[PDB]
Amino acid sequence: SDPLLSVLMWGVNHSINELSHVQIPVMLMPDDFKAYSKIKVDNHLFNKENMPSHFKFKEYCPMVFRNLRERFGIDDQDFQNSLTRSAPLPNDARFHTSYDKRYIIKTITSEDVAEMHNILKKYHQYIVECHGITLLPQFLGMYRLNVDGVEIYVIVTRNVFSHRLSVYRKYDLKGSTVAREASDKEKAKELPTLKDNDFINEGQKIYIDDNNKKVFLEKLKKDVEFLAQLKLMDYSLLVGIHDVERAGEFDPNIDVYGIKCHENSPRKEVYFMAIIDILTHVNPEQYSKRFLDFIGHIL
Amino acid sequence: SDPLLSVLMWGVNHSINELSHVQIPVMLMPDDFKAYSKIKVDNHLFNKENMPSHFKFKEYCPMVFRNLRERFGIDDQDFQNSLTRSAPLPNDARFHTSYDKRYIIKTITSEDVAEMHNILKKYHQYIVECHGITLLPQFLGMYRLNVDGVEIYVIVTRNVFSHRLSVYRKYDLKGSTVAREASDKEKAKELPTLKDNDFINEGQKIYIDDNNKKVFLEKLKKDVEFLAQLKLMDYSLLVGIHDVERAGEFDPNIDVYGIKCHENSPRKEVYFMAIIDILTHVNPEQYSKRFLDFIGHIL
Ligand SMILES: CC[C@@H]1C(=O)N(C)c2cnc(Nc3ccc(C(=O)NC4CCN(C)CC4)cc3OC)nc2N1C1CCCC1
Ligand SMILES: CC[C@@H]1C(=O)N(C)c2cnc(Nc3ccc(C(=O)NC4CCN(C)CC4)cc3OC)nc2N1C1CCCC1
């Protein structure tokens, strides 16, 4: 056990238990976007084996994230279990993934937390309008952890990749002018992280039918315009391919970002694509177009 | 809902959930008697309907009371349910009783808390030696509650009376020289609180067989010597009678203080007797003898 993780599991557990008692209305009030719950814990000569002795836990806008979870088809108990039944696994910007591979837990700066607060209402409204059908990150919770001296902020999102089906290739696409190539140290890992020019060079094709491709690009258009209108940029399209003839039917209700290949595909492939890395604030305007140009071409 | 109660239920719930994860050894260490766990909670614009916005909860020596509960045959989950499933009921020195009538919850002074800390180790050792078979109060938990401005201390004990069988008469016996009579305002309540001279005047007899009477007085002797040796005094014998031919078999494993009447008793009676009010610190020495003289006579 690493203390900051134990506090997170402890905290998510506590937070979801509290909410289970709250009466949940259909609507959020404007105050729900300014809300939080803090808990400070001090154990003197008690419970040394599991928890640290002195820790704080803060949940931002618990009602908003409760409402978002349900809008994204996530039940609070399942969300609880996925984060609590067993520890989240590391990858060390480092991230953790829930033991069941459903959720990602990433450390963010206080600046990112400030930007999240800044866009949360508009983000929530967007999710309402598109009925939760989007390629944007699905934000599920946001927390502050303190363990004697160290303060960190985390956000929780839905995993873009599958919780069963492995992924043998991964891309990260921005469609920028500034030459985007991968480095060689990455290449030597179980799954590297290829970039723009690796794609427009290793002759990578995505075999999805002309309907699936139409829906996707329509979504992508709306999402990216929303991102641009908030003056956000430097986001990527995360692309991940699962070869069936290596490890292939999936659950579209769990692996919500999956798209099957069309019938004429050279190999049985499942694609996982969504937008990631949205919280940084040449400009945002053309970045969106430049992003849309690129993806329209490569797909 | 009265806020201080909600905090207590909340707090007992939280505390028992924490312990459920702790590995419980057979032995307590000396540090366990100096231990505690504090939790401070701040909700900003959140959860107004159930909890107060700002409260603190402190549990003293959680390991000791965990150990005592089990020694008194109380399971932590049942204890939890009894205090949490529905609110405790008032009687307003005021007290509350769990909704299932199993437990008493009384407010105490910081001075009482200090005295409890002072005697807890010796008290625990006494419970070990008598294998939990005693007429002393069964202390099950001790807490501090804060709700914005107001700080209170509570202790939890097992109810001397039954959780089913009603009680139509109640005495409170010290066996003092100083004339002990009841007042008339008490008499007009559903169950008054009669005192020494009400007993040695209304010709009250306790019809228990000569064996039951032998065991009881032996216990009483040991208990009271223990109390005296801690320089404690001003405790009473709480006596409560249940007439079967008004409202009578009981569970000796729940109503642990009950004694059936012998076969020749004029009416079918069940007696509930135990020591109460021990935490005040002419002297303690003879008070014990004086107490023992009286009870030997009246029983
Ligand atoms: C909130 C961060 C952001 C985001 O916005 N969302 C929505 C997101 C959703 N899902 C994922 N999923 C994964 C993305 C990359 C990897 C990956 O690179 N895995 C390798 C596997 C082999 N080896 C152990 C080394 C690492 C694994 C993922 O989950 C299995 N990542 C997301 N990211 C990324 C993660 C942190 C920065 C970008
Ligand atoms: C920790 C306080 C102390 C103690 O040490 N123990 C062990 C204790 C264990 N059990 C009890 N039980 C009851 C004792 C008295 C009464 C009683 O007087 N009830 C009336 C009933 C009708 N009406 C609503 C008005 C009040 C009810 C009890 O439980 C049903 N009391 C105890 N007391 C006493 C309680 C506070 C001071 C003395």
Swiss-Prot record, chains A, B:
InterPro entries: PInositol-4-P-4/5-kinase_C_sf, PInositol-4-P-4/5-kinase_core, PInositol-4-P-5-kinase_N, PInositol-4/5-P-5/4-kinase. The modification N6-acetyllysine is found at residues 56, 106. Residues 1-299 form the PIPK domain. Residues 26-32 are annotated as: Required for interaction with PIP5K1A. Its EC number is 2.7.1.149. One of its GO terms (cellular component) is cytosol. In rod outer segments, activated by light. Inhibited by I-OMe tyrphostin AG-538 (I-OMe-AG-538), acting as an ATP-competitive inhibitor. Keywords: Acetylation, ATP-binding, Cell membrane, Cell projection, Cytoplasm, Kinase, Lipid metabolism, Lysosome, Membrane, Nucleotide-binding, Nucleus, Phosphoprotein, Transferase. Homodimer. Interacts with PIP4K2B; the interaction may regulate localization to the nucleus. Probably interacts with PIP5K1A; the interaction inhibits PIP5K1A kinase activity. This is Phosphatidylinositol 5-phosphate 4-kinase type-2 alpha. It comes from Homo sapiens. The lineage of its organism: Eukaryota, Metazoa, Chordata, Craniata, Vertebrata. The gene is PIP4K2A.
